[PDB]
Design a protein around this ligand. Structure first.
Ligand code: NFU
Ligand code: SF4
Ligand code: SF4
Ligand code: SF4
Lengths: 317, 374, 114, 166, 143, 121
């Protein structure tokens, strides 16, 4: 049990170093794509410190949740790190532990919306009802794909079914010729979910657009803003780690007490290659859409393809 | 119903105003407009200055269209008192105005691309504007608010070095205009964000007197460079523009036709500047030179009415000047800006569409408020 | 479902997460300035608490947690479902009595046959 | 063209029709009306030709003979074109004048500016609310009025020189 | 009172400009000082959308009577250490609007300005020079 | 489904940044007859009061008993109408444009200080 605390502290310090550095490389590439020098590489490690520097402002009409939601957001991200596949099988992975993952990946955004909406002026009230419509609209699209693949990798035999430690035993890519089509339909629905969860591209709706550019987080000002800008970057790393876990886990065997860190580096490199397409290219190449058009796209051209992929992969076994 | 304002101090906007809206959750049931945040009292200062000082108070009235207010005022004073203008002065005027409307259209093309996301189109069109900026800096003075038209004629001529310097940016833009022609026609974002919003019928386009590209987009062909024969404009070729030539044959003026019109006017200006550059004589530019005897003549010119009209980059503006003899300056001076009826026209074309349609509809017609609430 | 002692580890990792996240504010309150309490909301700065030049704010919002329409072919059936069910509950005593009478007869008729 | 002067002349006597040409080949017709003939002529311009747009709504002050003038423009189907100018006058003893916001529905928007700048209360227009003049501001303190109620003399602030303070 | 961990805001300032009655000549220079030819993001500046975030206000325009409380209202909501940079020849006493009943000129009599930049309008290199000069003042003020 | 900027962006990444580093290099060079800070002389000044008639933005205040005039250049707008109306030519336009400052009433932004005014008298 005490050997499960050392991992939860050390992997947290590792991920909190790496994620901001990936964000800095991303801003440099986006700046070079349109004829610019761009900021230096470790630029977020200055913005974080100056946001912790300043004077926090509390409005006169504010609850006890204004000062306590940017604690619970970071808390349910740090507590989510212990269940994620970092390349080796996770620490607390038992027979359940998929619904705990889906529940805690849903619950952080609800803490964010409750923290924004629990203030005064009604810019936050309009910038929150736009948030939860997009939250409800993007999570029947991943449940079907992940439940279909977790059910289908349990036919050929495993001892911890419906668990993320079971996803290193056997993958999709050895079910025969018909699975090669479900592979690309599932690459489609997972890239669409990964772009719509970290909210960049078409789906840059509730962040820097409250009627022009006000945003959802128009109100948090001091320490609280620094904590929220850290927590969203850790969640950026977590969701892409899930996407590279389901799609193609191809790690080395390499027994010993140092094959763990080699597999950890190889997983970090695959995370970088998956972000590089989605976030960078899809941010540079396409603007916003709308909210009434961002809802009828995730129920028509994403959720439909999940049903096609799940049904076609069910007709392979 | 919820009552939220629009805010004088925003992100996105460059001028303060108040567009009050009653919103039914996500739709708009009514919108009204109040203004008066740029109210610097322009007529009241202009009532006690002499004739020369209003020529410089007039161009600082707005920043983007800073040549038009300097132009029509001189047209009005010359129409009132009676002063001839030579050929070279008029040629330089139609070079400078037609060269600055490209500067006025490109930043509008960049700002509309900023409110729908798309930082890329912003940085690339504002990189393309710099050749016109360096030309205007080389010929006149500073970048914006440049003054080179007096009561007599122009203040400096272009010479022969500026001929070489201007005949290269034409060749530079002939390789740039097809790219923004080709991006604009078929995008996944432009035709899904600025199409079928704020439709304007011809009946309300005529009865509320919409003027500029908001008018001829829905279809009413009129142009003050054409509808009155002004200067050397008739004998070098001038036509109105229509979105039928740029984008197939559509006529439904919503937002997309207005951008089609603002690209067609660039295609007209690149030839109307080209042909008018070699058709000039040599002569004089400054009817009575050495502007000392001009300040010894302000007591003598006067006793009449006067009105002047011209094509602004956003519409058709008009000034009125009445002065009386034995005086220093005028008696009454009134300017009219082209975005006054366009701002009162769109407030009914915003008849229950969306919420995020508001910025892309308002910023579609250049809400340059600095000439609106004067 | 999961484990036998496994719902007790969830509390352990959750509490150690709150301890780290609260320790970070306990550090960052010391270095850096304090706080204060202003009120206008930084929300359309023209007015905070005023009366009238034109119409203004204080038109507060109720519970409207819907700003979207899927295929725009389901809201009509949902409203046609809620209308009949909403005006079934009349509030007259023969409704109560007739309901329990037909329930008793229904269970009796099924129990006689099979 | 140049024939509309004769057509307004032969129909409406006791008016001042004149034609002005100035120095680059442009002609403009000027006419000065009484009151009831002004309303009848604004009826007549809309029936003389289908809908013609008009530019400006200038008011001014000549003493106790306040005026109003307009720049209606029509026959713009050909590159010659024509543009007429109307004006009417009013006494300060009875500052009323009939509105035309039944024919040209934008004249209310210049009429509001006309009320708030220089006197001149029109007919029962549907809206008499003000625009671009602040509400925290006195009542009969008409700013573009020449000598009667120039705002005060004493609320003209200067932000003066540094030499005059040393 | 300025304590110590504020050397970092000299390497990452965030701006937010407050128009009060300008004629849109300097607002172009605020916007065009961030395009690829006169680039400024390599210092770290970043046009932010609310006065809670920012720490350099960037006031333009002559202070028009209607916009006189707004300028005094948005000055409290920016947090601590912040500076004020006045851009143009109309926060510095009007330019042609020094004799109106509507424009109360220089912006110093409303809020405590730090660095003025003359010109009409200034070229965008002068704005970079002004922000470098004000930021080295506040680096001096720390120590 | 239609992404036309993509070949442009991929070509654009493999080129030069095309920018201008200002605190390492000279700035963008000015043209010849560029407007700048107005420079003034005292020795050639007949005091004919012609500048105060034509200036749209009052920087000039005439003062008698010595036939000179002072100025405060922080309110100038660079419109040249004092240069081309002065007969004696003691007003020129310079090429400076880096004019940031700390205070309004500096020593660079005012000419003919009152101590020098009594030194003339
Ligand atoms: N175009 C244009 Fe302006 Ni800023 C307006 N309205 C002035 O003519
Ligand atoms: S400072 Fe000068 S250029 Fe800028 S808005 Fe004012 S008058 Fe215009
Ligand atoms: S500059 Fe010219 S007008 Fe002014 S005081 Fe000297 S000589 Fe007279
Ligand atoms: S440019 Fe000339 S007219 Fe304008 S303030 Fe300067 S000296 Fe005076």
């Amino acid at each position: 049990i005490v050997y499960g605390v050392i991992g939860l502290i050390l992997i947290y310090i590792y991920v909190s170093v790496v994620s901001l550095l990936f964000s800095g490389i991303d801003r440099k590439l986006v700046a070079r794509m349109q004829r610019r020098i761009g900021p230096p590489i470790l630029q977020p490690f200055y913005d974080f410190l100056k946001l912790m520097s300043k004077e926090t402002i509390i409005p006169k009409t504010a609850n006890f949740m204004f000062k306590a939601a940017p604690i619970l957001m970071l808390a349910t991200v740090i507590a989510l790190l212990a269940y994620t596949p970092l390349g080796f099988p996770p620490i607390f992975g038992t027979k359940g532990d998929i619904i705990v993952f889906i529940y805690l990946l849903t619950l952080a955004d609800f803490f964010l919306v409750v923290g924004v909406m629990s203030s005064g002026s009604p810019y936050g009230r309009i910038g929150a009802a736009r948030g939860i419509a997009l939250l409800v609209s993007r999570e029947p699209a991943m449940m079907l794909g992940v439940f279909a693949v977790m059910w289908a990798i349990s036919k050929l035999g495993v001892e911890k079914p419906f668990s993320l430690s079971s996803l290193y035993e056997h993958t999709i890519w050895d079910f025969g010729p018909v699975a090669w089509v479900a592979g690309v339909v599932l690459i489609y629905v997972f890239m669409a979910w990964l772009a719509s969860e970290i909210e960049v591209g078409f789906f840059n709706i509730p962040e820097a657009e409250q009627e022009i550019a006000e945003g959802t987080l128009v109100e948090y000002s001091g320490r609280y803003l620094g904590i929220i800008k850290l927590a969203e970057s850790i969640k950026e790393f977590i969701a892409a780690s899930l996407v590279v876990a389901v799609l193609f886990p191809w790690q080395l065997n390499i027994p010993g007490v140092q094959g763990y860190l080699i597999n950890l580096l190889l997983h970090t490199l695959k995370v970088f290659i998956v972000l590089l397409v989605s976030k960078t290219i899809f941010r540079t190449i396409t603007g916003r859409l709308k909210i009434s058009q961002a809802v009828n796209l995730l129920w028509t051209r994403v959720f439909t393809a999940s049903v096609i992929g799940a049904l076609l992969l069910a007709l392979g076994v | 119903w919820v009552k939220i304002p629009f805010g004088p101090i925003h992100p996105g906007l460059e001028e303060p105003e108040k567009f009050i809206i009653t919103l039914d959750g996500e739709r708009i049931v009514n919108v009204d407009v109040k203004l008066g945040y740029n109210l610097r009292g322009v007529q009241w200062i202009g009532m006690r200055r002499n004739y020369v000082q209003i020529m410089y108070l007039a161009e600082r009235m707005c920043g983007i269209c800073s040549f038009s207010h300097n132009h029509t005022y001189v047209r009005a004073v010359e129409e009132m008192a009676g002063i001839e203008v030579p050929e070279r002065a008029e040629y330089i005027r139609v070079i400078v105005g037609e060269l600055e409307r490209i500067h006025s259209h490109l930043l509008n093309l960049g700002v509309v691309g900023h409110d729908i996301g798309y930082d890329t189109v912003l940085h690339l069109t504002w990189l393309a504007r710099e050749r016109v900026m360096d030309v205007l800096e080389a010929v006149s003075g500073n970048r914006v608010n440049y003054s080179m038209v007096t009561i007599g004629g122009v203040r400096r001529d272009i010479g022969e070095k500026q001929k070489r310097l201007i005949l290269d940016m034409i060749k530079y833009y002939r390789e740039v205009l097809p790219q923004i022609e080709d991006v604009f026609l078929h995008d996944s974002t432009i035709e899904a964000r600025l199409r079928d919003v704020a439709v304007v019928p011809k009946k309300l386009a005529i009865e509320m007197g919409a003027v500029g590209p908001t008018a001829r987009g829905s279809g009413i062909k009129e142009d003050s460079r054409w509808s009155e024969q002004l200067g050397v404009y008739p004998d070098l070729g001038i036509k109105p523009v229509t979105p039928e030539d740029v984008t197939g044959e559509k006529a439904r003026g919503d937002v997309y036709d207005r951008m089609a019109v603002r690209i067609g006017e660039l295609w007209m200006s690149l030839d109307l500047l080209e042909h008018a550059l070699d058709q000039m004589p040599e002569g004089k530019i400054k009817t009575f030179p050495k502007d000392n005897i001009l300040v010894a003549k302000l007591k003598l010119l006067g006793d009449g009415e006067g009105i002047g009209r011209y094509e602004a980059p956003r519409g058709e503006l008009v000034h009125y000047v009445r002065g009386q003899k034995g005086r220093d300056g005028p008696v009454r001076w009134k300017p009219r800006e082209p975005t006054f009826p366009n701002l009162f026209t769109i407030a009914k074309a915003l008849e229950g569409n969306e919420l995020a349609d508001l910025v892309v509809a308002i910023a579609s017609i250049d809400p340059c408020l600095s000439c609106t609430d004067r | 479902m999961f484990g036998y002692w496994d719902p007790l580890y969830f509390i352990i990792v959750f509490i150690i997460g709150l301890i780290l996240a609260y320790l970070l504010n306990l550090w960052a309150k010391k270095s850096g300035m304090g706080t204060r309490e202003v009120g206008e909301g930084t929300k359309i700065f023209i007015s905070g608490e005023d009366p009238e030049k034109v119409i203004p704010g204080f038109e507060h919002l109720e519970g409207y947690y819907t700003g979207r329409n899927t295929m725009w072919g389901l809201v009509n059936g949902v409203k046609k479902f809620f209308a009949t069910l909403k005006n079934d509950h009349t509030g007259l005593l023969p409704d109560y009595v007739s309901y329990l009478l037909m329930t008793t007869a229904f269970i009796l008729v099924i129990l006689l046959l099979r | 063209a140049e024939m509309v002067a004769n057509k307004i002349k032969e129909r409406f006597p006791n008016a001042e029709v004149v034609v002005k040409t100035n120095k680059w080949g442009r002609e403009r017709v000027w006419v000065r009306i009484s009151r009831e003939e002004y309303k009848e002529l604004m009826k007549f311009i809309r029936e003389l030709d289908p809908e013609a747009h008009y530019s400006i709504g200038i008011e001014q002050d000549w003493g106790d003979e306040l005026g109003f003038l307009n720049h209606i423009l029509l026959f713009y189907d050909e590159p010659p074109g024509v543009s007429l100018l109307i004006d009417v006058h009013a006494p300060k003893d009875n500052p009323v004048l009939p509105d035309t916001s039944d024919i040209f529905p934008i004249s209310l928007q210049f009429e509001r500016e006309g009320m708030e700048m220089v006197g001149l209360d029109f007919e029962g227009a549907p809206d008499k609310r003000r625009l671009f003049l602040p509400d925290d501001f006195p009542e009969g303190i008409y700013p573009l009025r020449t000598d009667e109620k120039g705002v005060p003399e004493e609320m003209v602030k200067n932000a003066g020189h540094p030499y005059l303070l040393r | 009172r300025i304590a110590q961990l504020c050397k970092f805001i000299g390497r990452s300032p965030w701006v937010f400009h407050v128009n009060s009655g300008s004629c849109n000549g300097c607002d172009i220079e605020i916007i065009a000082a961030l395009t690829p030819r006169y680039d400024a993001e390599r210092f770290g500046v970043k046009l932010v959308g609310s006065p809670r975030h920012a720490d350099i206000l960037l006031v333009t325009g002559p202070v028009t009577n209607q916009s006189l409380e707004r300028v005094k209202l948005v000055y409290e909501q920016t947090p601590d250490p912040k500076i004020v940079i006045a851009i143009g020849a109309c926060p510095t006493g009007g330019s042609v609007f020094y004799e109106s009943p509507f424009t109360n000129a220089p912006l110093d009599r409303i809020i405590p300005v730090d660095v003025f930049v003359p010109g009409c309008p200034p070229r965008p290199e002068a704005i970079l020079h002004g922000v470098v000069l004000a930021l080295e003042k506040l680096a001096k003020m720390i120590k | 489904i239609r992404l036309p900027l993509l070949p442009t962006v991929i070509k654009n990444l493999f080129k030069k940044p095309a920018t201008n580093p200002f605190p390492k290099t000279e700035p963008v060079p000015v043209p010849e007859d560029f407007r700048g800070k107005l420079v003034y002389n005292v020795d050639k000044c007949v005091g004919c009061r012609m500048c105060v008639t034509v200036c749209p933005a009052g920087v000039f205040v005439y003062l008698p008993e010595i036939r000179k005039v002072t100025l405060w250049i922080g309110r100038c707008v660079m419109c040249k109408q004092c240069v081309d109306v002065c007969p004696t030519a003691a007003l020129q336009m310079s090429d400076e444009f880096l004019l940031a400052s700390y205070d309004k009433y500096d020593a660079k932004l005012i000419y003919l200080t009152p101590e020098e005014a009594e030194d003339i008298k």
